């Protein structure tokens, strides 16, 4: 009841292959070249133990920076000033070219793909979600505009108490393959999204992962491409990246748009570089100049009532899948749980990538330390 989705390969039936059919023809021609999409898989290294610290450059102004990175469970840290890498850090056991899960920084990448299609005139943010995904009729996404999804200004009954298996947040993970399925669970991410309800009100920010996955669904219906491919075509393939990114997929092959991307720190910085270059990447324009300007400008401040954000950034806001600090520097950031940031410092034409593994997903304690680092590093880049 979720309508047409992009086939896993040319001519594939809906939902095919599954874990139980991938060895059968015609699936197997595709599956034998893509088995990691069906079965958990490990890299077998072609290459035959200590932290790498090349902090520059900023080490003089921040002598204790490495210790501060250790204290916030930093896995990869990179500062791009202009086009130049001016500081790098990677923990022992994590190589410079290793990939790291982005969690909700993935959302900012999804918003970028939507922006690309807006630039092409294939998505109108003023249109209702149901213009593109009619099958969301009868759900909380029946009524709201695409822009309201982009800005996450839709009231949704979405329990964030993860430990409760009944919670929407854990059910979302189970539907998408991030957690073991329970009997009665939705078959895939699309079905889960259709189960969501709300009181109908809009206009106030509510951070909710479902919004990003609806955006990816819209992308698929508009382009006919799997979100996996759209993310490449409209963003990743234009970055001149060192490595492919990866994205977890659910049982239909739908990329887990809201949280499932992994990539290298250096490559993630290329996304920030594109944003600070007015939307243009090495391989071509990604989003319009206007789109970038709107991101840097922020969303409606009055919509933003998340004290977990405004306690630190009183004039903060959220728009188009980016957090906007509204601080004196105009900092904007992608953010994901356990300490992921794609942090933009337009003042110094710099991007800071910090990819981490805090023991906890989201506490005031970790955010205080992490934001202190990002701000101190940003200021260290100012001319003096």
mmCIF file with all atom_site columns, C-alpha atoms in Angstrom, residues 114-115 117-119 122-129 132 144-150 291 320:
data_model
loop_
_atom_site.group_PDB
_atom_site.id
_atom_site.type_symbol
_atom_site.label_atom_id
_atom_site.label_alt_id
_atom_site.label_comp_id
_atom_site.label_asym_id
_atom_site.label_entity_id
_atom_site.label_seq_id
_atom_site.pdbx_PDB_ins_code
_atom_site.Cartn_x
_atom_site.Cartn_y
_atom_site.Cartn_z
_atom_site.occupancy
_atom_site.B_iso_or_equiv
_atom_site.pdbx_formal_charge
_atom_site.auth_seq_id
_atom_site.auth_comp_id
_atom_site.auth_asym_id
_atom_site.auth_atom_id
_atom_site.pdbx_PDB_model_num
ATOM 1  C CA . UNK A 1 114 ? 16.190 17.574 -2.312  1.00 0.00 ? 114 UNK A CA 1
ATOM 2  C CA . UNK A 1 115 ? 17.761 20.976 -2.900  1.00 0.00 ? 115 UNK A CA 1
ATOM 3  C CA . UNK A 1 117 ? 15.889 18.672 -7.413  1.00 0.00 ? 117 UNK A CA 1
ATOM 4  C CA . UNK A 1 118 ? 14.407 22.005 -6.347  1.00 0.00 ? 118 UNK A CA 1
ATOM 5  C CA . UNK A 1 119 ? 17.168 23.691 -8.371  1.00 0.00 ? 119 UNK A CA 1
ATOM 6  C CA . UNK A 1 122 ? 11.435 18.918 -10.109 1.00 0.00 ? 122 UNK A CA 1
ATOM 7  C CA . UNK A 1 123 ? 10.384 19.545 -6.510  1.00 0.00 ? 123 UNK A CA 1
ATOM 8  C CA . UNK A 1 124 ? 8.319  22.537 -5.359  1.00 0.00 ? 124 UNK A CA 1
ATOM 9  C CA . UNK A 1 125 ? 8.680  22.884 -1.568  1.00 0.00 ? 125 UNK A CA 1
ATOM 10 C CA . UNK A 1 126 ? 5.326  24.696 -1.447  1.00 0.00 ? 126 UNK A CA 1
ATOM 11 C CA . UNK A 1 127 ? 3.526  21.583 -2.672  1.00 0.00 ? 127 UNK A CA 1
ATOM 12 C CA . UNK A 1 128 ? 1.991  19.093 -0.227  1.00 0.00 ? 128 UNK A CA 1
ATOM 13 C CA . UNK A 1 129 ? 3.927  15.884 0.416   1.00 0.00 ? 129 UNK A CA 1
ATOM 14 C CA . UNK A 1 132 ? 4.667  13.412 -4.738  1.00 0.00 ? 132 UNK A CA 1
ATOM 15 C CA . UNK A 1 144 ? 1.978  19.426 5.336   1.00 0.00 ? 144 UNK A CA 1
ATOM 16 C CA . UNK A 1 145 ? 4.159  20.902 2.598   1.00 0.00 ? 145 UNK A CA 1
ATOM 17 C CA . UNK A 1 146 ? 7.513  19.543 1.479   1.00 0.00 ? 146 UNK A CA 1
ATOM 18 C CA . UNK A 1 147 ? 9.130  22.635 3.006   1.00 0.00 ? 147 UNK A CA 1
ATOM 19 C CA . UNK A 1 148 ? 7.546  21.816 6.371   1.00 0.00 ? 148 UNK A CA 1
ATOM 20 C CA . UNK A 1 149 ? 9.173  18.391 6.134   1.00 0.00 ? 149 UNK A CA 1
ATOM 21 C CA . UNK A 1 150 ? 12.488 20.028 5.168   1.00 0.00 ? 150 UNK A CA 1
ATOM 22 C CA . UNK A 1 291 ? 19.438 27.319 -1.383  1.00 0.00 ? 291 UNK A CA 1
ATOM 23 C CA . UNK A 1 320 ? 16.427 22.341 5.146   1.00 0.00 ? 320 UNK A CA 1
#
